[model samples]
Target: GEELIKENMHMKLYMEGTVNNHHFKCTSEGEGKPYEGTQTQRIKVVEGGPLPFAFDILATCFSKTFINHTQGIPDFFKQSFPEGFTWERVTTYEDGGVLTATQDTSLQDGCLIYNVKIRGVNFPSNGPVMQKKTLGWEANTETLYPADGGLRGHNPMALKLVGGGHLICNLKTTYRSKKPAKNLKMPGVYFVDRRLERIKEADNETYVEQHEVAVARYCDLPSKLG
Candidate 1:
């Protein structure tokens, strides 16, 4: 059981959990077990800084016969977490750039599930997290009607904001297949902007870049409910 969390000027990421299944292992189809070990990783991205994405990944293994084959979660987080965010600030103490995935694809068929928590945040101009405040929403009203003899636009100008949810990643890979195929997935930088409103009710013009940092850690044994 362990709880590890780190923070820098830009952002903070933390992971806390325990590992009990010594026999837990994951690998590819035809190839021998190429990976073994129980490891977890945490990645973070600050709110205002250059990077807007973060991720955490973990993996474990069991048995000895499958030692020859690579048995681990491939570059899962790198593929899912980088979209729509700038990769300006990155730090990996235990590992740099790459992190491992916790779940095994073979045991659960062709899919690997990641239990993750995601947050969309905007930092204040000054002060701490609790002291910061929101600038309110824009007026959500617009009407384009051809009434009487002329055209008109009438509606509340307040902005409507929605969405605050996490993600359960269902990933598929060719590593576990008997005959692996060449995947032309090239890495590229991306920028994602979710402009909900041009101006707030207080006439404060604000724009926030979506997809903030994400944190991950180990969990208890899977029960009937899961």
Candidate 2:
């Protein structure tokens, strides 16, 4: 089953938490440079921009966490860069091809909301896209919501989408064929999903501005797989 195990690489997502603000204003700092003016410091909390530098709302809700997936991906998969932070990634598969995964998990009063997406370069099927799809499962056709604090701690930050944050996740799989599996007619027991019921779209690219350095918190989770 090594091949299956090799092919078994899947991304585990957690959308069980969310913070209080939808936007934030941040100043600039990096490897070497002078600070931009206050205008430059007023960063809007949007996708592809640096907001979660020391802040990744994803890990905040789950409070304390850990991770695992495969050898091909990086351990700092969850790190938010100083350049700019966006919910996306690109990875080369076993065949030397590439795929991009995009997802954003936000926390609510005690849980997180999530999404699914797909991106590629002739690989056929792989994900972490900006779009979400449901697998006709329990929350099928609905975004999967998981609880981060898991019934412990005070969820004041999670009291609203503006604080506390959430835990969210995604579904990843390779077409179970030598060729593209098309609509996934051939099921793979990897991604907790059996099939998609239609997930919600995570508009991080849209650029919505909300709060800044307001204090938030999760364990470490990877962003790619071999």
Candidate 3:
């Protein structure tokens, strides 16, 4: 885990819980992500209680080595999270509920890639998550509406926000399949805007280019509720 969640990372995604039989993993998936770019940290549940289970993603936006957009660099260069960012949210779980189906895609920021990992402990089957101070949400009421309208777009975890300008992520879980699958699917790591708000709310506004980092489903041991 330490090897994968490196020290030079620009973003830290943390999740811990009180639920049993739950596994935590992060993946970077998109349309065109590069090789081995999707796999992230795989943190296992500690049985019960508060623990800092998380991963660090390297945010390398506007890197000098990449030359595609370096084309517009000389003439124009506004910016993205050129300095990286941070975010936090808490989720609860109960009633022997499991993540029926959830997916996290990737973002191509400059020359790097990043991904989002989600976990739960004391939450209802699905509801609003207590979001911490994360950056990148539009604060203007006037402009907030447009972005709020944008938030209406959609997702993998299938999150819902009341309106624009706020960074509240109301996650809804459901199985796309007829039968509920008993496996945890984790995507890869990639370069993206670590703004929890934008990540949850914005629709494909990650960057110019994106792709699938990777995807793998970890099978859970079938057992009666403990």
Candidate 4:
């Protein structure tokens, strides 16, 4: 006689109520700083020069209203630097790196990779009120673009680039390698995704910026398992 051996199924809801402590933490946890697969280009501007900082219009709209829809974004949010502030001229040096400038920069799109260092600060409300401020405070600089790409839902303040280099994201995913026994071979059942989607970019834009504080994570890698 053939006997049935039932396999256990586990359901974990990765939602605000159960996962993020009732929608309290907007930034993510357990994941390290947002840059996992984003490419890096040494972006430098003279300390006193106009350091280029901009965002996607769609991202700003969603962030302020906490809505995860892309259709309602407007174009007023993509200005570089705040209204009156400017990037003061400063100098920097580093190994050979690449950078892109606006169309009228008097050179090719990707050239003049300068290196400058500004005091790294993340306190938005109390930080330097530069030309580009997020919520009346200077936004943080991170390696991730569309700060929400690595997040569960879309985020505003995403950097936007027009025919320029992009901040690419390579997310982490789990793979199922082996198949279960015959009892688990049902084909009709499947898992569904419940995350939100927000933001859209015009045809000309290539990159979006992400602003977030520094982060750290705890993980066990193959070396540990080995």
Candidate 5:
């Protein structure tokens, strides 16, 4: 009787059924940030560097959008309601240590789509190296393709091995287990979408670069804990 709720970078997720006698309800949400997952990755980007200006922009934009913004949910979820449709959230059990619940709604509207579970340390642990997993999805007109696997930690900006030695490129910053985060907050998971727009200003010398971020959520964990 356990429920697992995983939202894309935007804090939106879909859940149904009961786990351990816990009953879930829907909710009506307002505008907010996107989901980034329980863990956070500090992605580093340089405006100009070894790579060409265009290359730097493209590379930084791609990684930032994919790693930091892209997220998905079930097809059933909606991106926008016609006029009167809202969201719902259901909870069966929650006590800080134990959490079981579900939410099927989206503030941003449309299904961006879009896990299972495991028993680990209690919430707010000193600092545990939790196992990491990955999930994939594709977005069409409305519904995004769904997949298996649950939420896990990720550090997209971390170093990589291009040939043999560590070909260091980007730097990543992850959340510390028990300490309060200075920049990164929210101990819960996250899911977000990104939009890039380039503006050629009249001043020819400078251009306006806009990076828009969208976030969406729902779940089976303790509302209090979340």
Candidate 6:
């Protein structure tokens, strides 16, 4: 199992979970879609210097996907773990900037579920034209998932605030059909804001990027409990 997960680390994504006989996987159909969200970020340093700073990212967005070639419902939505997954994610910027990040999963005391090791990047948006800043801050967030139930698997997960901004991820799961039928689900929004700013410490002004990441889910709750 470790080997399989390791191998998939090279790919863009791979998700597996069995609820009874229903297994689940993350795959692509045709051209993939784009992800949208809003964010604000700042960075600072810990001690006086021309270096060091704090960083943050607050964003809310989601992406969609299909279950290969399923009939009836050929469209569903999906979202990645705010901290990345056991796979690598390759993101392309509109200005031709491209980035690749390897996703990580941990069972450590306070580090559970998936995470990605990423240096800070420029915040993208259409709201206002602001100065672009990069602090090279490294951050991570803790996460947890809700119980899996029903075909309407709108289960939610939250990437708690530990080192950046909170990120919410909502998901649905299902096994590949024995028959070639594609399934669908819409993964909902991701919100974040992180930045670099000033700080005052003691007799000097130190700089440190205070990193805290928090994530919550956005999905329709069940109409009634069984």
- Which of the numbered candidates is closest to the native, going by highest TM-score? 6
- The 0-to-1 C-alpha lDDT of every candidate, in the order given, reads 0.20, 0.23, 0.23, 0.18, 0.22, 0.25
Count of clashing pairs, candidate 1: 23
TM-score of 3: 0.23
Stretches of model 6 off by over 4 angstroms after superposition? 1-87, 109-208, 213-215, 219-226
Alpha-carbon TM-score of each model against the true structure: 0.17, 0.21, 0.23, 0.16, 0.22, 0.25
Q: Candidate 5, residues 84-116: lDDT per residue as tens digits?
A: 112211111122222222222222343221111
Candidate 4: misplaced stretches above 4 Å?
1-24, 27-163, 175-183, 186-226
Pitting candidate 1 against candidate 6, the one with the higher lDDT is: 6
For model 3, how does the per-residue alpha-carbon lDDT over 27-134 read when each residue is reduced to its tens digit?
Answer: 232222121223222222222312131111111111111112111111000121232222222221222223222222121343234333444444332423222112
The true-versus-predicted C-alpha distance at residue 102 of model 5, in Å, is 36
lDDT of 1 by residue, 124-185 (tens): 22312112222223322222222222212222222122232222222111122111112212
Q: Relative to the unseen true structure, what is the Cα RMSD of model 3?
A: 20.1
The deviation in Å at residue 74 for candidate 5 is 22
Tell me the lDDT of candidate 3.
0.23
> For candidate 6, which ten residues in a row score worst on lDDT?
58-67
Q: Give the alpha carbon lDDT tens digit for every residue of 83-201 in model 4.
A: 11111111110211112111110111212111111221221222112222322112322121122111122112222234332332121211111122221221121211122222232
lDDT for model 6, on a 0 to 1 scale? 0.25
Candidate 2 local lDDT, 1-226, one digit each (tens): 1111121121222221111222332222111011110111111233334322123222221111012222222212112111111244343433233444454433223222233343334322222111112121222111112122111111111111122332233322121111222311221111111111112212331222211111111223665762
Compare the candidates by lDDT and give the number of the best one. Answer: 6
Candidate 4 lDDT:
0.18
C-alpha lDDT of residue 47 in model 5:
23
**Over 4 Å off, model 2:** 1-86, 124-226
Candidate 3: regions farther than 4 A off: 1-21, 32-78, 90-109, 115-117, 123-226
